[PDB]
Structure formats: structure tokens, C-alpha cells
Amino acid sequence: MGIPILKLGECLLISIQSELDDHTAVEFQEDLLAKIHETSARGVVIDITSIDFIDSFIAKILGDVVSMSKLMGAKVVVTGIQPAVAITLIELGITFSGVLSAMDLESGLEKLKQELGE
Amino acid sequence: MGIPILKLGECLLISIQSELDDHTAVEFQEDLLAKIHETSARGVVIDITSIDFIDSFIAKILGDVVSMSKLMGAKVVVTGIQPAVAITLIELGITFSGVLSAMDLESGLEKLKQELGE
Amino acid sequence: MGIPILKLGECLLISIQSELDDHTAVEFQEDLLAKIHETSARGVVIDITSIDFIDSFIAKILGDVVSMSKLMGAKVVVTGIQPAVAITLIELGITFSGVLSAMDLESGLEKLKQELGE
Amino acid sequence: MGIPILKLGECLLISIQSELDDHTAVEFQEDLLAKIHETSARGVVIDITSIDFIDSFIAKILGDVVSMSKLMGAKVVVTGIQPAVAITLIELGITFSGVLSAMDLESGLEKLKQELGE
Amino acid sequence: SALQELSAPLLPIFEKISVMPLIGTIDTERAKLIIENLLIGVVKNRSEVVLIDITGVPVVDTMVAHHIIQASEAVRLVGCQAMLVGIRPEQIITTNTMKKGMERALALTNREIVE
Amino acid sequence: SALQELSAPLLPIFEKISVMPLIGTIDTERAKLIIENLLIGVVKNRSEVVLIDITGVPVVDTMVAHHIIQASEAVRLVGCQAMLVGIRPEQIITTNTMKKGMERALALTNREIVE
Amino acid sequence: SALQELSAPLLPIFEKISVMPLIGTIDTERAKLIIENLLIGVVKNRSEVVLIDITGVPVVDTMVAHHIIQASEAVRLVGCQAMLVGIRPEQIITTNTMKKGMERALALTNREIVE
Amino acid sequence: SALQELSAPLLPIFEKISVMPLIGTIDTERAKLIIENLLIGVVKNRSEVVLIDITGVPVVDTMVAHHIIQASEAVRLVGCQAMLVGIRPEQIITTNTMKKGMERALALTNREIVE
Amino acid sequence: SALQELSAPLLPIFEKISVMPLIGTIDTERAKLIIENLLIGVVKNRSEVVLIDITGVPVVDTMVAHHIIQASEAVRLVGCQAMLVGIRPEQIITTNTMKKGMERALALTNREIVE
Amino acid sequence: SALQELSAPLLPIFEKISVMPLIGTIDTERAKLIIENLLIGVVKNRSEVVLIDITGVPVVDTMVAHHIIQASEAVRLVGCQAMLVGIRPEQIITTNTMKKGMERALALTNREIVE
């Protein structure tokens, strides 16, 4: 089991369903950075559309995974954010800027289509 | 819980975890069909790279989910097959014929631009 | 002593006058498949215009070399089937698919020279 | 019954296997001219590659079917003559001129189509 | 009497079968392969648009459509009825009408009629 | 039983007469007039290639050939046989063979072929 | 009851199967084939958008997909449901919905929408 | 039997009415308006080519031929009959055939099918 | 008798087979499928030009030869022998010689070698 | 086991060496010089990649590079191992990988890869 990943044309896709806590995030984040080493990726598209809720401890992980993989050498687009998670749990209690969000995965990959030249 | 589907440029990208049982595979194969109605898809790229062993009666059903989509109105491609399962299960007298199996996910959508996008 | 087989430019033009039994049929079967490896070739033109009666023990020998030569590495064409022998071929019932026969040895070489090695 | 004729776009062909007597040739000499009446012709191509010894009366016959087929309109090509037939046995009372000999049946056509019919 | 048709514009061969649903008319299998090498005829039409109805043996009619495949070019069963294709579980390329039956058989020998 | 021939390959509408040259075949006069006004055939053909001979029926065969000119156009006897035309009691447009008879058929309706 | 609602918008032919889950309507095979050749119908559609949980009707509804190959040009099943394709106890060309299946039908007979 | 028809040839919706000359038209008055905000249908064709006759409810048929003019656009009646039109008590654009009505729908939305 | 050699001119992967006609030598079936996902060749060859003969492996050499179409696609057999298929119990794209087997395996992947 | 290996691409025929590292395998020279007058003998790759190691006989394997030069065109030792060449107690064209050995071997016969 775990959280999968999939190489796609010098980019990198990843789907995420409703995970539990920071333990389910650190078993994910150590499996995201380890395979962005192996693939010579340049953009990771974190599809998180299928998420009910996100705990406050995950806000200091997924609000800092964009500060994680940027230093690794690849841009990150947090695409597919639900309304319920976005209001008071990605609220004004974090340092959320420079994250390059999108709306849906077709417009997500369209944005990172124009970072690999075309 | 489950095995998800993400829309990406009028194509589908089923990525499966290590599922080795038919009563979950029949529980899975509804999700391929119940999504392809709602999103007007044309080619579904089933990624089976993360599956090591398969049971025989699964291949009498997963060998027929090609005919699920091919009658539904969208082509299907089976990418990333392990060398073990093609020599311990497929050499049995099942009747794979005209399935158009790719090699890896990079060469999948490159072949699946040649069904949509000139 | 034997059935006269000649060669043309990158083609073989075998002509049949008459036979005796299956012993001449297996001797002719050993003749053509050896000769097509004794030299190089890409197209066989079998001429059977001079035969008006073929036994079921013989039509399989002309069912052999019409399909053993395709696996050997050359395409085959059996031109000029008489209407008397053409009845008992499919009254037996054996489809000559992939054979693409013609009416006479001039028009038989029209398609084969066109198709492979234009 | 061993001597085929396989005419090819107003250009005939002749295969000749191992003969043993001139009683074969007299039944054969009428058969070539009976074909050149039934179809139009421009050049017959006699092939005698499979003969290592020749009766002196047979050399009178094969030296005659040149001039039997010149008067009908067509040219002749005596292609693929072996050494041992030619060296000490065609030194007999021949008058071989205007015969247009060749080396092999593939090049024997293009020494005739270069002259007549094209 | 017991003979149908044999004449051609020499690239195709037309043919017509009026109503004769009986197995003793084996001559439409017999005297058809005879004419296919008496001329050099290429893909030929059947045009059974008035034929009601073969019940027992279309094996004399649908296996003769494979006889012509090996002796010559293909064959077009032009214009079947509605009753004739009632239940036929027992492929070959057909058409609908004799005018457009001639088109997609002439497009095999690479010619048409345009001015 | 009660049938001679009909066809419809193109806008020309041709016929075929096998050997039954009696005066009771007035239907081959009528059937080529019945099918004529229904589906519009400018050119028609005859194709009496296999017929020996005519005893006392040009009145019902070729005297009525004028009656298709007033119907539409262009009766064309395709290949009257050698012994058929010995002494005629009784003009029209005819030809030699169907493959070169239809060549002048489309030349009357101003159409040609292309390879 | 006694209705199936077939006509011809273009040279292809539309056909709509509404909620008719019954084996008594064999006439969707019968009364379609009679009106198939009643006009010139080259291709046609089926469009079973909602008819879900139909049993052995494929013994009719697939052999009827084989008769249109014979009497005319090909036929397209349009938009099968999810549970319908789950009934496969035991080829043909299909599509997703009637606004794109009609478009690939015109792509066969060489026409497209312009401007 | 509380169902008639619906379709989608990607801009308009053609619709078919087999014969039901009663007050059961309150289905097709209602169930056809609800499709107009289910998808973006500009044009719709009524196609009462098979209906004889209308007894006392064209008042229901003219409101539904005027509700669409204030819902989206371009209702049109396709193929009335000679017996059907008999007395007119009471405009609305019509056409003659099902084929040619579809083309002038594209002429009101600036399209035409050629290649 | 260690193994069978394999390397690559970067698009295809060649292979050689010497005299190993026994079912205990399945290593040519296992260690050949292993190399396919190791380096992603598209076409590959067998080149059994020097082997006489085959008795014990009639299907298992061609079963795996159909089962790199699962992952490559299709292998091309190079140079079967006259004794090898002079008789056998009973598809597979094949060629005759490696200098022509390579020259047409490139054409399936759209490359060429021109001066 | 009277073999070493062999193959035959188009003009540059090449050879392969698996693990057979002894003086009793001088056949890889003897069977190799026979093929140089069995066909035309332009450049030929050794490809001793699957070999660890050889210390005993480099006089057999390196002086043979100056045996084929005087008989035919030159050779290329393709893919020497890492610690194989660490043993050099005591020139010739060479490369590193089989897929790029052909990139310069075809340059000496005036052929270059197109598309």
C-alpha cells in the first residue's frame, strides 16, 4: 500500500485520497522525495481533490512540502483544493504564499506544460 | 479508500496499488465504468506497474475489462506489465488479442496523442 | 527428374504440370522449401492451371507450402485455379486467406511485384 | 509432361530438365510452336541450365528450334549454357549467329526487353 | 431456360438472379466459375434483389462467395431483402442497391465515372 | 415462371434475352416499358448475344424499338448474331459488344470514365 | 406500444430506444429492417441511453447489429450504460454519445461540419 | 408509457412524436421544456410527420411552440399533413421534410455540411 | 553452457540461439523477458538461422514470442530452416536474413539508413 | 560445445564473446577468420562486455586485431570491463558501448542514421 506516484513525460503526477495524520504524511513525504530523486522530475502535481478534512498538524507539512520540494529542485502545484479544507484550515495561521495553486488537473498540467518549455 | 481515477487531457490514468484479489477487482471495475460516463473520456491508460502477482480468475475478468471499455466507447491501453506475470499467468490459455499494451507511461500518452490531437 | 522450378528477378515461378501421388507431393514440398533457402527469395508464384482434379491428401500439401512458406520468410500467391478443382477445395473447406490468388501467371506477378519491393 | 510453358506478357519462357533421348524432343518441338500460335509472342527464352551432356542429334534439334521460332516472329535467347555442353560439343556443325545468348534467366530477360518489346 | 446471365464490360461482371429457390439450381455455382476464366473478369456482383426466399441451403450461395475469392477477385451480394436476412447466423462485403453496388466495387479496381 | 429480365446498373437500364423467341414473349415488350417510366432510364440496352433466331418476331421486338425513343431514348441492340440478320423485311442505333456498346451509351448522356 | 420513432435527419438514420425492457418487442428488429431499405439508409445509430438491466435481448440486439452490415453499411451502438456492459456472458463499432457518434458516422461517408 | 423522445445533435434537439391525439400532451409540454435548461439547446424540431390528426389541442401545441421562443430559440414544425392542417383558428417558422428542416436550422446558427 | 547473449543497437535488441533444443533450457525464455524492462527496446529479434532442429518446444517458443507483444511490441523471427518447419503440428511476423530483418524492423519504428 | 558465438548484420558483420576465458578457446580466432572470406569483411565488433576476466591470453585476443586488419577492414573492441583493463602488464579503435560502436562503424562505410 501507501500513496502512489507515476512518471509522465519529464513531469510527475501523484494522487492522494483521505489520509489520516502526520504519520500518514511522513510515510508519504519520505516516499515523495525519495522518488523525485529517482525520476529526473521538474514539476510535481499533488492532486488532493479527494480529501474531506485536513488536520492542523498536516498544515505544517503540506504548507511546507512546497518549501521542501522547491529546495530539492522542482516546482510544486497544489491542485484540487476543496472548499471545506480551504476556509479555516489553510487559514491566516500559516505562511501560505508562493505555492502556485490550480483548480483542476487538466488546468494543472496545462500550467506545468509551460514550465518545461512547452 | 479505493483505487482512484484522475482526468488528464481527455484521458484517464488509473494507477493501481498491490491488489491481488478478484472480489476487490470486481469491486474496483465499477469505478472505471462509473467514471467514464461522467467524464467524456476517449482513452484510459490502466497502469499496472505496481502489481507483482495476479490470480488466474482475475485475468478472466481483468482480461475482459478491455471489452468493458472497448464496448463503452473508449480505447484502453495496458501499460507496464511485469515480466513475471507474463510468464506465470499469461502463458496459460487465456486469449489476449488486440489489447495494444504500451511499455511505460511516457510512451503511453505519446501513443495516446495519436488517437486525439493529430 | 522432378517438378520444374525456375527463378526470376527476386521471385520464384514454380509451375505444376501433373503429379502421381502424395510421394511426389512430399518430394515437391521438400524441393521448394529447400530451394528458397538454397538461394534468397521474397515471392513465390505457384502455377496450378494444368490440374483438374486434386485429392484431399494432396490439397493439404498445397495447404502446407502455401502457409509454410509465409513463416519461412516469403509471401506466396497461387495463380490460376481451375473451376473443377476450385469446387472440391471449399467443398472440403479450407480458407486461403493471406494468399491473394489471381487468374493467370501474368496478372499473378502484377500484385506480388507491387506489394513487396515496389 | 515435364516441359512447361508459362508465358509472361507476350514473352514466353521454357524450362528444360535432364533429357535422355531425341524421342522426347520431337514431341517437344511441336509443343513450342503450338503455343506460339495460340498466343502472340516477342521472345521465347529457352533455359538449358540443367543439362550436362547433349546427344549430337539433340544439338540438331536445339539448333533447329531457334530457327523454328525465328520465322514465327519472336526472338530467341538460349540462356545459361553450361561449360561441358558448350566447350567440345557445340563445336559441331552449328551456325549460331543472331542467337543472343545470356548468362542466367534473371539477366536473360533484360537482354531481351532491352532489345525487343520495350 | 435453366441459365441466368454471362456478359460483362470486362472489368466487372454483372449478374442477375430472379426467383428460383431450389437446390437443383446448382448451375449458379457451376456455370459461374466456368465463365470466370473464359474471360479475365475481376470482382463481380450478384444482385439478388428479387429473390424470396432461400430457406434451407444458402450454402450453395454463401460458400460460392468464397469460390470466387480464390479463383478471381471478390464478390458483392448486392441488395439483400428484409426477409432474407431474418435470422442468418451462418464475413463477405455486401451493398444495398445496384447503382452504389457498382461504385464500391469499381473503387477496388481504381476507376470511377466523373464528369 | 412469368419473368424475362430486369436490371438497373446506372442511369442506363439494360436488358437480357436468352433463347425463347416465340410470339408468346410479348412480356419482354411490356416489361421494358413497365420499368421504364418508373425509374428514369435515358439509355437502354438489349444484349441479344445468345439468340438464334428470329422467325416472325421483329414486330414485337424491333418495330417496338421505336416506341422507347418516344418513351425516353436510345434503343441499342447489342450484338445481333451473324445468321440472325440474313434477310430483313423492314433507322436505329446499334453496336457490337456490351463492353464497347456501353462506351457510346454514356457518350449520349455526356459522361465518361477516369482511371 | 406500436411505436419506435425512426426517420432520417441526414443521409444517415437516427433511431431512439427509450425505456422498453421487454422481449415482446422483437419488432425493433422487424419494423426497422422493413423501413431500413424503404429509403436509402447508409449508416444508422441505436442510442440506448437508459434501458438498464436487459437480459438475453442481445440474442436479438446483436444479431440485429449483424443484419445492418448485410442490408446496408455499418451500425453504431451509442452510449451503453455501466450495468449493461457488465452483462457480457459471451466486432462492432461503438461511441460515447449521439453528438459524437453521429460525427464519426459522417466521417465514414466523408462529410464534416463546416464553419 | 409516460415518455416520448429526446436527443442531442450537439447544438439542437430533434424530437419525434408518434400518434397520441389526447390530453397526454401534458407530458411533452412539460418534459420537453425541462430539457432546455438541462443542456444548451438552441434549435428544436417537432417532427409531427406521423400524426393524423390533432383533435382539439393545438392550443397546447402553440404554447409549446412559443415557450421555446422565450426559453432559448427557434422552434419549428416539421412535416404537417394535408388532413392535419384542416381548419386554422389562429407566425411560427415551418419546413417540409425532416432532412431539409435540419439544414435551415444550421442556417439560423450559421453552419452547413460539405467536404 | 551459461546463457544466451543479448545487446542492442539502441532501438532494437538482437538475440542469438545456438543448438539448445530441450525443454530444460527455459533460460532463453526467462532471461530474455528480464532484459526488456531493463532497457526499453521496441523491436527485437531471435535469429535462429543456425539451429537444426526443433522437436520438444513446438509452442513454448512461439507462446513467449506472442508474449513480448505484451511489452515490446512484436518480435520478428529471423531465418527459420526448411527442416525446422518441413513438418510441425500447426500470427508471427518473420523475415529471412538479418540484413533484411533489421532493414524492415526499423520501418515499423519509422527510421532508416540512407547514404 | 563447438561454438563461441556469431551474428550477421548488413555490411558490418559483428561477433560476440560470452564468458569462455581460456587458451582452449582459440576457436574464437579460427572460426572468425573463416567468416572474413565467407562474405565481405568491413568492420567487426568484438563486444567482450560479459567477461570477467582475462589475464592469461591477451596475445590471442589483442594481436588478432592486427590479424583482421591485414585480411579485411579493422575491428573495434567494444566495452572493456572496469577491472579487466586494470590488469595491463603490457593502438586500435575502440569504444564503450555496443549501441554507440555502430555510430562510428557506419561512418567508415558511408552510412549515417536518418530519422
Side-chain angles (χ1 to χ4, degrees), chain G residues 34-65:
Chain G
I34 307 148
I35 208 163
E36 167 57 73
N37 60 332
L38 191 147
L39 76 161
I40 35 168
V42 169
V43 311
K44 76 198 304 153
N45 311 330
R46 315 294 320 118
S47 88
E48 39 261 17
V49 281
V50 48
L51 83 176
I52 324 171
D53 185 71
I54 40 167
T55 56
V57 187
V59 183
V60 168
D61 213 19
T62 319
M63 306 329 171
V64 80

Side-chain angles (χ1 to χ4, degrees), chain B residues 12 42-48 62-63 65-67 69-70 74-81 95-105 107-116, chain I residues 42 66-74 108:
Chain B
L12 301 194
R42 285 310 186 102
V44 180
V45 192
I46 306 184
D47 199 291
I48 56 155
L62 192 67
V65 298
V66 48
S67 196
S69 158
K70 269 189 173 202
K75 300 295 184 74
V76 75
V77 289
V78 180
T79 174
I81 318 178
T95 310
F96 283 100
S97 66
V99 191
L100 179 72
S101 65
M103 294 72 65
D104 46 352
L105 211 52
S107 191
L109 293 203
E110 184 175 357
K111 192 163 286 195
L112 264 294
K113 203 215 181 168
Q114 308 307 305
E115 299 293 327
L116 187 146
Chain I
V42 182
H66 185 63
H67 288 175
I68 331 110
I69 316 184
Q70 299 288 334
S72 47
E73 46 89 18
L108 270 299

Side-chain angles (χ1 to χ4, degrees), chain E residues 48-52 78-86, chain G residues 33 37 70-71:
Chain E
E48 57 181 0
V49 293
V50 185
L51 189 146
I52 295 95
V78 174
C80 299
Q81 288 272 120
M83 175 54 192
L84 182 85
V85 288
Chain G
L33 284 171
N37 60 332
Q70 282 187 320

Side-chain angles (χ1 to χ4, degrees), chain A residues 87-107:
Chain A
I87 295 175
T88 190
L89 309 99
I90 316 184
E91 79 302 339
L92 68 167
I94 47 164
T95 55
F96 208 75
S97 192
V99 203
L100 304 91
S101 177
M103 185 47 231
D104 46 352
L105 216 69
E106 40 166 356
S107 196

Side-chain angles (χ1 to χ4, degrees), chain D residues 3-56 58-113:
Chain D
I3 307 301
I5 297 170
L6 60 157
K7 62 157 280 282
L8 195 140
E10 78 260 11
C11 301
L12 269 74
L13 282 90
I14 284 292
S15 176
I16 290 173
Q17 288 321 292
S18 45
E19 272 183 348
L20 301 177
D21 58 338
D22 65 330
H23 286 76
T24 304
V26 179
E27 214 180 20
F28 149 77
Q29 193 154 23
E30 275 299 317
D31 197 21
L32 178 71
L33 299 162
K35 192 75 175 47
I36 210 163
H37 267 159
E38 189 195 321
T39 178
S40 43
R42 294 299 196 85
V44 75
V45 186
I46 311 174
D47 167 72
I48 48 168
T49 319
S50 296
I51 285 178
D52 276 331
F53 274 103
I54 178 164
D55 186 74
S56 89
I58 279 181
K60 295 174 62 180
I61 299 152
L62 270 193
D64 176 47
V65 296
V66 171
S67 295
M68 303 288 275
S69 166
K70 292 292 271 304
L71 271 301
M72 293 294 176
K75 271 299 182 79
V76 286
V77 167
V78 188
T79 184
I81 311 168
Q82 270 303 285
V85 50
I87 173 174
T88 76
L89 284 95
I90 317 297
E91 57 90 20
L92 264 66
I94 67 158
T95 325
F96 265 54
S97 297
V99 183
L100 304 100
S101 170
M103 187 45 212
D104 42 353
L105 188 49
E106 315 190 17
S107 81
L109 268 191
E110 268 73 23
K111 217 188 299 303
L112 188 81
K113 312 298 272 185

Side-chain angles (χ1 to χ4, degrees), chain J residues 10-109:
Chain J
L10 45 101
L11 200 66
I13 191 155
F14 90 109
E15 198 269 340
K16 184 65 185 295
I17 286 183
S18 162
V19 193
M20 289 301 301
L22 71 154
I23 175 62
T25 39
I26 203 167
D27 271 311
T28 186
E29 159 207 356
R30 165 196 297 105
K32 173 182 59 200
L33 280 175
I34 294 298
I35 206 168
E36 292 313 297
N37 54 3
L38 198 139
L39 77 161
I40 309 300
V42 79
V43 302
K44 177 192 62 48
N45 298 329
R46 316 295 315 122
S47 174
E48 42 167 350
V49 54
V50 282
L51 196 142
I52 294 100
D53 47 351
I54 172 65
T55 78
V57 281
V59 182
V60 176
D61 206 19
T62 313
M63 211 71 66
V64 75
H66 202 74
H67 297 164
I68 317 156
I69 283 177
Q70 52 194 0
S72 89
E73 196 64 30
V75 295
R76 282 173 178 89
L77 269 73
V78 177
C80 297
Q81 214 46 55
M83 284 306 315
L84 180 138
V85 292
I87 304 298
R88 287 303 102 170
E90 71 272 15
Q91 194 159 351
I92 45 176
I93 307 109
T94 183
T95 174
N96 198 19
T97 319
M98 170 61 178
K99 48 183 65 70
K100 84 188 193 199
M102 217 61 57
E103 200 163 310
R104 50 183 306 164
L106 285 178
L108 265 300
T109 183

Side-chain angles (χ1 to χ4, degrees), chain E residues 6 14 20 23 26 33 41 54 56 61 64 94 104 110 113:
Chain E
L6 49 94
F14 37 74
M20 36 175 64
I23 312 168
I26 208 178
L33 284 152
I54 283 289
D61 200 28
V64 73
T94 79
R104 51 191 280 173
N110 198 81
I113 296 177

